Amino acid sequence: TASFDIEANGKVYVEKGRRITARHIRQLEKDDVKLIEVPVEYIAGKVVAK
Amino acid sequence: DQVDYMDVSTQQVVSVGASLIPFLEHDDANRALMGANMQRQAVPTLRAD
Amino acid sequence: SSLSILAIAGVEPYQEKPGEEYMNEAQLAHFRRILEAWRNQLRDEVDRTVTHMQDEAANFPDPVDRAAQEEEFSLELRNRDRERKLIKKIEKTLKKVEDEDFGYCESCGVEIGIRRLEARPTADLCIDCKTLAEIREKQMAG
Ligand SMILES: Nc1nc2c(ncn2[C@@H]2O[C@H](COP(=O)(O)OP(=O)(O)O)[C@@H](OP(=O)(O)OP(=O)(O)O)[C@H]2O)c(=O)[nH]1
Ligand SMILES: [Zn+2]
Helix, strand or coil: CCCCCEEECCEEEECCCCCCCHHHHHHHHHCCCCCCCCCHHHHHCCCCCC | CCCCCCCCCHHHHCCHHHHHCCCHHHCCHHHHHHHHHHHCCCCCCCCCC | CCCCCCCCCCCCCCCCCCCCCCCCHHHHHHHHHHHHHHHHHHHHHHHHHHHHHHHHCCCCCCHHHHHHHCCHHHHHHHHHHHHHHHHHHHHHHHHHHHCCCCCECCCCCCECCHHHHHHCCCCCCCHHHHHHHHHHHHHHHC
16 A cells, blocks of 8 residues: 555656555556655665665 | 377276276266275186186 | 346346446345345255255165265255355345445445446455455465
8 A cells, every 4th residue: 555645757656545456556667667756754664684 | 289198098097906897987986996895805716707 | 047146036237327326225225135135045045955954864774875975965064054154244245235335345445346246246345455365365374
């Protein structure tokens, strides 16, 4: 589930709070989406790999 | 256009003892089982026919 | 064809009208009828089954035919157990319909297709959530 608006190139791909479906994945791949903005709080949850 | 192999012959599913019973195709499995088990216990008669 | 779940009742596939809202009185009545018919049939089938089991049961002198007569009963009882498990699911679906909270996915608020509900009227989730849950299930099970 998106914890923030998943957007790129001025386009919101997934509205905040929507579950990401196969259609969402197909749209992101079709649009050559390779970089998205994230908040620091989302990464703070994560475990560093090195 | 997908079958890689095929059974060599129909008889390969069953052993020799069970293979000797005729018309296995119409017999319940349990009675086939007992048929083979008891059939192997037959005693030779005076004149085999 | 007299073999589906719409066939059990004398109902024919619905037809959502152009500007028809999703869940209206008529659709709710339709699905309630479907579920009630399904249930009552299953219960009558259980009654048949039980009468059969009560009539047949006897003491056989041969150990290789007591197994014969108790190997079809095991399958029959299996089917009956499964349908008994499904009667609780039908009851719950009748509770969602009576409460007027029927037709939407339980995971995400998206509404479940009408044709899917006519396919499996007990559907609780949308196809996507259903598939993901099925994966999680098979993985926690196997
Ligand atoms: N006759 C019949 N029974 C149904 C039907 N739909 C569901 N059931 C039974 O109801 C039980 C509950 O199913 P669920 O755990 O809710 O899984 P589900 O969401 O896919 O329906 C199942 O038992 P189960 O233990 O999961 O089945 P199984 O694992 O022994 O195969 C299933 O056998 C149906 O359409 N017809
Ligand atoms: Zn869903």
